[PDB]
Amino acid sequence: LLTATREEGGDRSRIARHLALAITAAEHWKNGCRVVGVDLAGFEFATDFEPVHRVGLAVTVHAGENDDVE
Amino acid sequence: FVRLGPEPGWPQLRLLSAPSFPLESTLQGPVHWVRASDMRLRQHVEGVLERSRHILAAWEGISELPIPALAAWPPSHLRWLHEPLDPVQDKAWVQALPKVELHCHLGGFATHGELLHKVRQEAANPESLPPVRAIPLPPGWPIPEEPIGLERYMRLGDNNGSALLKDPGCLRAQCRLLYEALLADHVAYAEIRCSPANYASASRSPWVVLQEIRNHFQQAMEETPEDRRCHVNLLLTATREEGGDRSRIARHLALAITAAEHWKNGCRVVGVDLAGFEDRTTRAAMFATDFEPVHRVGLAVTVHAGENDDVEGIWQAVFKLSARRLGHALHLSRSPDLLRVVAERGIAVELCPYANLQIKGFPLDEEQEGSETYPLRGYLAAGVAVTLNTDNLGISQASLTDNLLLTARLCPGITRLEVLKTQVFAAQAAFANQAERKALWARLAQVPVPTDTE
Amino acid sequence: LLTATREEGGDRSRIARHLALAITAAEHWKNGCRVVGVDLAGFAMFATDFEPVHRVGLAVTVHAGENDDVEGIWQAVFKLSARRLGHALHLSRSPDLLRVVAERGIAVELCPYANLQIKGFPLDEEQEGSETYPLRGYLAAGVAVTLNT
Amino acid sequence: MRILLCSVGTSWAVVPEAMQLLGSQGFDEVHVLTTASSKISPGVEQLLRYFEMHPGPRFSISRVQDFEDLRSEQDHMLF
Ligand SMILES: Nc1ncnc2c1ncn2[C@@H]1O[C@H](COP(=O)(O)OP(=O)(O)OP(=O)(O)O)[C@@H](O)[C@H]1O
């Protein structure tokens, strides 16, 4: 799984390339170890992830350090 | 005694050293008997003085010269440059210019003829080649007697493209032949836009196809002497196919974002060329954050304003996609505000004379400029950065030189200095970095001297 | 240049006033002293508020002040398309944007005294370090850095 | 470093006089430019004797092998 972690006050370039990295490696390997999905260490990006779901990668959100159910 | 005063010297003649032009002397006792091997020194001095005279004569007004190295041209040649271009006599001089290519699709380079056969016979799976269909060209090609339409123009390139390029051998043949065609036309910098996903297979992911194309071009560049090496970068095409298919668009954007960093020398991926079609459902607001990542990483964008965008596309693309180049922006004169925003912001406009003539159709061989006159000179006057390119080599059946010389028929009164200005604008508006730009500028200074001068 | 500055807790009525005034003054005059563009001494996105300004062709400069963020500079360049960034002293902290500002020709207006008095930098240092003024770093990277008052 | 270069003709008393432009200063080395004409050989010998009787700075004499006397423009370009 490829991580796409949000940083508070930092750049969003990493989140920009990890998603592109996954969408490319998802089609590249079809046997053995594969990049099967993506991960989110934040938002706990409804428009950033339009590409991912279109290609067919599963997304696993990570509710990190909060107590909000929204 | 009488003193005539000091002689400070001449800048290009006070640095000379004796060994460069040795003097042969025969010794006879105390008197040296010198001898002159040749009069190379006299010719050296005469050339230096003539070049200095040309520099000083054309010095006043160097700000008007597209290339600062033109100040060494003879004043007669400088007068010649400022005259109208001639399609008949200027074949050779145009053929000798170090040009720049910025709109050249890889999928339409050998769509018909000897090149198509050379590509086909290079396939690694000869029995998997689709049958060569029948695609009669319209009469008068490459100068149609009437516009044929974007649909028909696109359909003319069926023999090549996704039909054949899935085969690695055909892909390699396409790349090598395209590089040869570039070299044979004296192109000092190119940006070939490919569609790797369209050439993918079950066993060949789009990334593998892109890597193979890049490495083929890198190999072709490596074998050529650095004096004639046409630095070629790559642009990925995110075609706005109808229906809403976004799998290929997303794949292409991700592949571009990956290749942008994977390679940092030789052939590279420098941007994307979003087509953004017209039909009121894709336009240029298709952004929807789709092109947000490409901007986020420092890539460039170049739209393909289609066969009827009508000023709204040329604005949606300029101000929402942050496009740094616009293709076929032929209706730009409509809004006098876009023709000024483009000029101020420095957004280059890519034009294709032959493709535009064959699709939209324009008045030809006109004496003056009317309502329907080709907008090349109109764009140049306003200050826009207009560039001339080839679009599809195979389909258009006309090289860069043919496109350049067709302007003199499309735009009455077009001069040669404006051709040089278009070349300089194309060089300056390219997506190269410091090294590529420096090599291109060093290559551009070598303008071929005219054969006539009168 | 008409400074259309947002007010922290203020009213957007002044921003509307200033955008309309600039749009009208742009067309009114064509000789001598003119109205060239609008300065945004309030930058965060202000995207749709500025669509009319671009439609008529006025330039927009983005005024950075008392800031240490690198996303303001990023949204200035791309969302409310700016042609000059004011006081952007922290731009090397994102090597991805010191190469788009340098490639798109987005001038960076540096104020030596203003930036020294607001924040303070090492003075007359023998060799450049990590705290020195970023002028030369911007210049050597191809940035069109200016100097003002 | 100070040097003097001068051509010579039928008046061989030219280089010696010219060598005193700096007067008592003198010159580091003076070279003589000469043609192949035989009317100047006595002048060449006189200059050689003058240099021998006035030692110090280096001296040299060069005669134009292919330029014996001025007849046409080709000799002029060769000179
Ligand atoms: N002049 C043009 N105007 C608009 N779209 C064009 C033009 N030429 C090509 N295209 C489209 O852009 C892409 C061209 O890329 P390329 O030719 O490398 O791929 P392709 O799939 O092999 O193309 P084609 O359908 O021409 O064989 C295709 O989507 C083609 O439809």
Ligand SMILES: [Zn+2]
């Ligand atoms: Zn195109």
